Design a protein around this ligand. Sequence first.
Ligand SMILES: [Cl-]
Ligand SMILES: [Cl-]
Ligand SMILES: [Cl-]
Ligand SMILES: [Cl-]
Ligand SMILES: [Fe+2]
Ligand SMILES: [Fe+2]
Ligand SMILES: [Fe+2]
Ligand SMILES: [Fe+2]
Ligand SMILES: [Fe+2]
Ligand SMILES: [Fe+2]
Ligand SMILES: [Fe+2]
Ligand SMILES: [Fe+2]
Ligand SMILES: [Fe+2]
Ligand SMILES: [Fe+2]
Ligand SMILES: [Fe+2]
Ligand SMILES: [Fe+3]
Ligand SMILES: [Fe+3]
Ligand SMILES: [Fe+3]
Ligand SMILES: [Fe+3]
Ligand SMILES: [Fe+3]
Ligand SMILES: [Fe+3]
Ligand SMILES: [Fe+3]
Ligand SMILES: [Fe+3]
Ligand SMILES: [Fe+3]
Ligand SMILES: [Fe+3]
Ligand SMILES: [Fe+3]
Ligand SMILES: [Fe+3]
Ligand SMILES: [Mg+2]
Ligand SMILES: [Mg+2]
Ligand SMILES: [Mg+2]
Ligand SMILES: [Mg+2]
Lengths: 161, 160, 161, 160, 160, 161, 161, 161, 160, 160, 160, 161
Amino acid sequence: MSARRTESDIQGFHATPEFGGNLQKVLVDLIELSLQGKQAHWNVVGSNFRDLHLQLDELVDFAREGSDTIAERMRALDAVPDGRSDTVAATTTLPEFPAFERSTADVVDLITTRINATVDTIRRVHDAVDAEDPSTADLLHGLIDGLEKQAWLIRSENRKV
Amino acid sequence: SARRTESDIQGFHATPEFGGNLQKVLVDLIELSLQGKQAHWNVVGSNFRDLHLQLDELVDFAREGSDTIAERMRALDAVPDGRSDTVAATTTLPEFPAFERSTADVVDLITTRINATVDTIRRVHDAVDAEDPSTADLLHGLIDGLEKQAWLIRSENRKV
Amino acid sequence: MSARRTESDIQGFHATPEFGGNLQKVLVDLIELSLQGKQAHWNVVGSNFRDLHLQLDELVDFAREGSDTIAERMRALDAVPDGRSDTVAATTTLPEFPAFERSTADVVDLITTRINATVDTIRRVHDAVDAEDPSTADLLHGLIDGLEKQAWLIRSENRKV
Amino acid sequence: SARRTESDIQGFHATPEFGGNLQKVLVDLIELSLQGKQAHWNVVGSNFRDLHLQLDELVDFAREGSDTIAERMRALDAVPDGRSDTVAATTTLPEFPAFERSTADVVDLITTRINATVDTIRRVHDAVDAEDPSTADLLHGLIDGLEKQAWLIRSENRKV
Amino acid sequence: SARRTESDIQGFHATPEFGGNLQKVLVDLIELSLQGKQAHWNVVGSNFRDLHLQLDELVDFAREGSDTIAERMRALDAVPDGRSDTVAATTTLPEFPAFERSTADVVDLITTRINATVDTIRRVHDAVDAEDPSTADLLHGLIDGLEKQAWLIRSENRKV
Amino acid sequence: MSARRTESDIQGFHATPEFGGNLQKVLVDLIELSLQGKQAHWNVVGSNFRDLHLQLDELVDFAREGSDTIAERMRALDAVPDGRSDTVAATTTLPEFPAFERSTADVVDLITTRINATVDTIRRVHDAVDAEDPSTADLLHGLIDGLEKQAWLIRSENRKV
Amino acid sequence: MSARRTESDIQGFHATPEFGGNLQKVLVDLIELSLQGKQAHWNVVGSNFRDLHLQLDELVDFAREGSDTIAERMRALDAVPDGRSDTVAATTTLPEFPAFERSTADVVDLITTRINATVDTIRRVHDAVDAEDPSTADLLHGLIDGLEKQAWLIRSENRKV
Amino acid sequence: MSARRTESDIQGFHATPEFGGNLQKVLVDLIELSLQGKQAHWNVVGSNFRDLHLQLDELVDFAREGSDTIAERMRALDAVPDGRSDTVAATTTLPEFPAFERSTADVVDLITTRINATVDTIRRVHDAVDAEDPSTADLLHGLIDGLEKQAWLIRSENRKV
Amino acid sequence: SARRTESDIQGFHATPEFGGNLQKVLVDLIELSLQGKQAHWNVVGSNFRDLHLQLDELVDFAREGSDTIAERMRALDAVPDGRSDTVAATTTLPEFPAFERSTADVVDLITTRINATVDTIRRVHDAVDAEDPSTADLLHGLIDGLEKQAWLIRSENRKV
Amino acid sequence: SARRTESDIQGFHATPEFGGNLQKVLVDLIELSLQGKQAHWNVVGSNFRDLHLQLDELVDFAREGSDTIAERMRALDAVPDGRSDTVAATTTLPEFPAFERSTADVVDLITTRINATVDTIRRVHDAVDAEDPSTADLLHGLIDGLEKQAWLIRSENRKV
Amino acid sequence: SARRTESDIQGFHATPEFGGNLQKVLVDLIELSLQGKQAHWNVVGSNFRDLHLQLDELVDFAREGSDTIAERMRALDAVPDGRSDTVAATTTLPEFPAFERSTADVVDLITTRINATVDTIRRVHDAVDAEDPSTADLLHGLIDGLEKQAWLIRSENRKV
Amino acid sequence: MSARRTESDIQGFHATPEFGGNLQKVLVDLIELSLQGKQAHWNVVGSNFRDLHLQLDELVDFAREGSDTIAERMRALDAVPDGRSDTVAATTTLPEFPAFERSTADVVDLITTRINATVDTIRRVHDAVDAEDPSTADLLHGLIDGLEKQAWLIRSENRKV
Ligand SMILES: [Cl-]
Ligand SMILES: [Cl-]
Ligand SMILES: [Cl-]
Ligand SMILES: [Cl-]
Ligand SMILES: [Fe+2]
Ligand SMILES: [Fe+2]
Ligand SMILES: [Fe+2]
Ligand SMILES: [Fe+2]
Ligand SMILES: [Fe+2]
Ligand SMILES: [Fe+2]
Ligand SMILES: [Fe+2]
Ligand SMILES: [Fe+2]
Ligand SMILES: [Fe+2]
Ligand SMILES: [Fe+2]
Ligand SMILES: [Fe+2]
Ligand SMILES: [Fe+3]
Ligand SMILES: [Fe+3]
Ligand SMILES: [Fe+3]
Ligand SMILES: [Fe+3]
Ligand SMILES: [Fe+3]
Ligand SMILES: [Fe+3]
Ligand SMILES: [Fe+3]
Ligand SMILES: [Fe+3]
Ligand SMILES: [Fe+3]
Ligand SMILES: [Fe+3]
Ligand SMILES: [Fe+3]
Ligand SMILES: [Fe+3]
Ligand SMILES: [Mg+2]
Ligand SMILES: [Mg+2]
Ligand SMILES: [Mg+2]
Ligand SMILES: [Mg+2]
């Protein structure tokens, strides 16, 4: 037992209220993005429908995994997520997705904007998150990388050169 | 030759009532999936792991269900609305509470909200079946699947 | 505003005693079919042994999945299944499978008859089941379809010209 | 004690009219698969790849469907006819045109072909359902699956 | 040059008593699988899900075991009897009770059922081993597998 | 320095009308074979039903993959395939498959003959195809090999001693 | 304190010459069985061709895995296997497989006899093997079980009533 | 060769003795955690046994992969790990796991403490590791994230709300 | 016994001309793969996703092709050179441009460079076949595969 | 009815000697796995890759072996101790050295320690078999598997 | 209308000399597989593991090849003979020596055995190709595959 | 819409010219490493050929995935990669790989040097990359970790102790 600790209880790392709040901000924007992504997935019409239909689902898959990652990281650090519809609608920074069928050109521009809004949230909280817990900032890096890749893959459709 | 002479054959077009009924099912499925994930993250206490895992299975089913319904709407020329504001404003599900909740409370809460979702589907079933039996088959899959989830979840709280 | 319901307790669909009894009838015949299917699978000998041996296992797989489906549907609807050996033996409507080894030709005829008997049970209770709960009748449709396919795949061995 | 004592129990038998109704579905599903492959090979133009791929998915579904229908016929002791001459002579689908076709033209052509196939299934549905609800469930799967393909393909040409 | 010159060489033949010993194992394994499914459906209460799942794993093992035993009998030209009437009439397992049962009760009930099945295999072991060591190896697999299931299930009720 | 070519446009290999016609001949017989293979698969009854039912599906799988291979090779070489039902029926060299149910023995003989007919088409056009484009002749070799294997696996049922 | 052994070199279990010879006997009969199994697989014709063709390959798979198991057990125990064609032919106890095509019925009888011969070798050496090394006898039990199952699956084709 | 280096030998990054020591500290605690996790996995009894039994194996899987990651990162950086039993026992910071059967409630509390002790070690060395080699600190972030997730999943069992 | 008495049997040795011909094929395949990845990253505009994906498929094929050829060289005692300087200095492919390129331009550019690669293989084919038919079979796989890629890519730009 | 009338049938209970023998096997398997990983990380020199890989295979086997034995103990109501202090204090294996070791030295060292582990299993075998043949079958799997590993590893150092 | 009217159309028939040529290939492929396993078991020394593994890959390829050849014979109504006595009596391969062999010796021995097998295939190639080009394609696959194995194995002994 | 942004266009993060240049440097060295890795894979001969042959392909797999990662990260951040042969040859920092067959000993030393040169490039740009975009620095950490592991696995072959 030469180096063994003898404390009966050893407590885990507990996130500050500010840290919890910062992850909550990321969470709602990821959930909103998933919901808007599905809306776009269903209602997109026009030239190159299939590629967009498929790409939007890939985006939704990533945003959903992202939200679960963030929420569970909150839980791990003794913080409590709120991903309920009312909370997401009331607190998301994303511009609202319009109703009805939308052209592929419109959807490309709309979804690129909404991805960028989500990335912006993660980028805004990054430094405060990194200062408290570098391991969580790494999860944010995964999100930034994965989402900015989605934005490039989607926006490239509308690019005229 | 028995070949049809037409050049533009139109597909089955849903009435506004029919589209509206599927929209009702859609918002409750989306809400159930959001509440399912909330419960999944925030459940604590005796038998946490089983509940945490079962809730994810419920969510998987409700998400595939929502996609099934929304795409059936698209196939029949209806337009789904699964946006957060619409879901919050029109869902019939009792609101899921915030914060940590015990496994016993989560069992009760989620069972109620599953049953609420099933109730929506059962409520619209006959009007859907009357117009389009093929869509009612999709509703049957939903009823069967969710009622299975309700049984698997609620059995945790059953006394002898 | 809000369309949210306010009940703290919402109960599920509860099957009538009659409905539960009808599903129980289906259950015992499916279990009996599985048991007879395995008996035949082990004890068939003669021309085209292997094909029959293999097809019988496929039949057993389907009947087993079927029995679990029906019993679990019963549970979902607050009914209580009984698949115990004594109950199955005392209440199955299937003619009993004979003892000892049986020829391929005999097994084809015997098993076809027992599938037909199992399907007849499902078809007999169908309308009463459909009347109370159309979703369960859909499960019955899968059983009818799957079992009648097995009957075709098995019986065709004995059909001439 | 509840055991039936008859030595040979006969299975459910379909009327010959029921068989003929399924035969109508079969030929149109085979025709659809043949036209789908023709389109898959010969489609050219903007968004080639998506159409090339989507057409193969339609063919996959139509082939599985035709197998499902033919084997249901066999299960009920009807006898399918999927031979080229019979398909050509009895299909209700408008003929697919020869040569390379633009993606825009293929979208419209195939949507019509799918809609024709669905129409056949919808036309026979009630007579099939009256005799055998289990078979009508198979028709529902086909209606749902094909109408999904119609939506996925036609959306390419939709201007909003 | 070392080649044997007899045209038909007979395989190993098991005595009828050996066959009867394997038959004893078979009926208890089938009974166990039937009781395991009964428990799997009807178990309710705290830690439902784990028990529901563990019971299916036990049934899987018991079903594979019964197939193994019956096919070993066939290999040695014995003739298994796995019919419902025979199983009910000849199984040594205490009957499983009807109706919903609490998880605590199911744990104790099934542990006993597994222990009864293992006892049968242990009782016939030495006579089987004396005649055919290869068959006794199969019995070892069953003893090891079932006693593992007994431990996995009973541990739920163990208070320390 | 550099071995780089300087053309802004380099065209691909273009098949002669004759070459295209030869591949079209192969195509229709492969499609006809697939259609007859499925007909036989559904309608075979009698001794050893299951083996034949299963082998016929394997034959159909190969003929379908073959038809796609040939049609796509045509497209690669700027030829235009025609696999429409009317064309297949009007131009196939295969004897027509008979109507209604057929015995296992009959199906073995019928399908073997139709495979033989399909292979004969490929062998007849082979040298002309090989002369123009050896790479396509290699695809023909796979078809010959794969189909003659099917013929062996099917016909052996009817071969005595 | 410590229960650690202090030897710089600990040798493994070394098989007696007799033990090695007994495993060699098993090896050659397994290899011969694999070779005869393939011969039968290629050259069987007649009623129920396909089932036999397929089952024979399963038998060959098992006998090949068996030969590798025995030879490798020999190596583990410092014995040296000989699976060369000349040795197999000169020392196998199996009756030789006949030349040319053979009927399904003939192949069933021939192969059953050759499996029986292979198993007899294993059963003959068993007790001497078990006496020296019970772990190897366990490998022999798997071979006995697996091969006798093959014999049942193959022979049942020819068993009447 | 315009930007090409012309040195014959280019050496890799070599960890300092302090860095090597820091990774060694993480290594022994990960190995100890794996050993204690298995002990708990085997000996846990009582309410919700199966969930705990299973979760403990998941923990062990992660801790084992973690130890291999750390050890191989040491090797990559020209450091030498020591994961031997005596070294692990003598130098681990983890409180000793008790002997005998332990209740599920006890095991939850015990294992949460031991996970937290492991995380604490990684957190203690993090900044010194990050200052020398940010790429290694990233591997530490994976460990912190994965282990704190395990602690949340395990401790939630005992949480009364 | 028909056994050969030799102790050192040598393998088939390729002439320098033959090795040189395979080397020609190798550099154009490597160049095509590098150009394919450049296009894959830098393509933008209408139908981006399909092109981005198709280009990766082309690259996969050209890379497996390069390995096939280089290892065939090794098998026949020839020595491949796939180094960047050698590829740049000896490839016959027109240079792929830098910077972002439109989907329409990428279709045209990549089709030309695929056709250039196929041309190399077709140019050496007869001399390769004359010496070693087995190697010409590998060339056929390459011709077939790349000409398929050319068709899939160029069809995007085809007008009616 | 042949049904047993008991309500509480107990399972096979291992003697303290039997539990002690399995405990002996357990600590040597755990020690072998720890030494295997040490060797895996620290081996250098000629044929590094093969040895690095083979050592991981040995470790996988010894870890699954340790779990097999510990859980067999649990099944028979014995209590394993796999803790670091217990393993260090009671293992019979010669200590594996620290620091980098050559492939030649690693071959020799690991072969010795495998043989030591096999020796433990062979030492307890007869007493285990006498009490419970089913457990001795598990021991046979271990002997077979580890002796295979010894052969695969030591063959590296064998001279002609 | 283009349909042939003969009731039985005969398949392609191979001359008996063609059959004998394939028989020559078959025996050497079987011999190679048997020698490959012998080497795989009995190889010892530096780089044991890589040789042990590579030899199994060669055996895999030789076994698949022999199946390919025998089944091609069957397809063309030739009759293969793969019996031990025939293989031993008619193979052209130098006998593999008995006992343990060093990795260096095995490399040289097996390279020769592969080269002998390839030589047989190359010797019969032109007569096979003249009668049936489709069969010669199979021979090409074997030549390419075996010569790859020769390169992979022999490279171990290559000093540069 | 309480927290929702109302901007129609939200632009993504755009890499500076310096950042783009830094990633370009990493890209060319990864591509050069892949090309040299394949050259070594093909032309390596001598003792332990197979292990080296195989390990070199694993290296190539990682370097290829790395180059795609870097290039696509450039695209995501509105930078433009150049992975063309001429550019790679003209701008890589890697010492040239020699022509012809090379011994396994030579290849180990050569490839270790070239891996280290690639790692050095990534390490040289790391801090400038990290200062502008921490999420990209994380991708660099993956590359450093994965490549230094390859160097250890390869170089260990030549290590004499
Ligand atoms: Cl679980
Ligand atoms: Cl089969
Ligand atoms: Cl796609
Ligand atoms: Cl390897
Ligand atoms: Fe990371
Ligand atoms: Fe209905
Ligand atoms: Fe229905
Ligand atoms: Fe259904
Ligand atoms: Fe070919
Ligand atoms: Fe065993
Ligand atoms: Fe960082
Ligand atoms: Fe040729
Ligand atoms: Fe060829
Ligand atoms: Fe024994
Ligand atoms: Fe044993
Ligand atoms: Fe989750
Ligand atoms: Fe969708
Ligand atoms: Fe179930
Ligand atoms: Fe079918
Ligand atoms: Fe079975
Ligand atoms: Fe295609
Ligand atoms: Fe082996
Ligand atoms: Fe490792
Ligand atoms: Fe390679
Ligand atoms: Fe375990
Ligand atoms: Fe075969
Ligand atoms: Fe990419
Ligand atoms: Mg597209
Ligand atoms: Mg058969
Ligand atoms: Mg639980
Ligand atoms: Mg090696």
